[PDB]
Write a protein that binds this ligand. Structure first.
Ligand SMILES: Cc1cc(C)c(NC(=O)CO)c(C)c1
Ligand SMILES: [Zn+2]
Length: 140
């Protein structure tokens, strides 16, 4: 589980979005596993605006923050899960690291702020949904 809180926006894994998230939906993209809902109060997380390929993510399944290299966001084939059938996930970054279904929502951060959230796993590789192209999160 886990969310980014920037301005009056809340960014979650589409598959872990609540009734209130959908009820207060701003934007979702199933192919990205992303959803943004409107929030009553202001968030404090800074979104990275950068082409960083190194950072630290939180892995709840190890209660540990792992420094990682990660690939640039790309269209990648992701095997079937509880929430999506075997499909091509867009805006996805891969690193070598541990990832279990419940690690979705763990933040990936570089020196600039939040790069994305854990979205995929398996075969000793963690996948993060990029949010750095969503410029509109830094305004209204
Ligand atoms: C955090 C996380 C971990 C794993 C193993 C998976 N599974 C897949 O990659 C697809 O089957 C998903 C969706 C999320
Ligand atoms: Zn950066």
């Amino acid at each position: 589980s886990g969310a980014i809180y920037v301005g009056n926006y809340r960014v979650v894994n589409r598959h872990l979005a609540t009734h209130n998230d959908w009820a207060n939906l701003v934007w979702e993209d199933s192919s990205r596993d992303l959803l943004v809902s409107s929030t009553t109060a202001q968030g404090c997380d800074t979104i990275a605006r950068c082409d960083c390929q190194t950072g630290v993510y939180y892995c709840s399944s190890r209660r540990k923050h792992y420094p990682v290299s990660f690939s640039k966001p790309s269209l990648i084939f992701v095997e079937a899960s509880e929430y999506y059938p075997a499909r091509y996930q867009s805006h996805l970054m891969l690193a070598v690291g541990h990832s279990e279904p419940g690690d979705c929502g763990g933040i990936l951060r570089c020196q600039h702020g939040v790069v994305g959230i854990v979205s995929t796993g398996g075969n000793g590789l963690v996948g993060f949904a990029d949010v750095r192209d969503l410029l509109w999160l830094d305004e209204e």
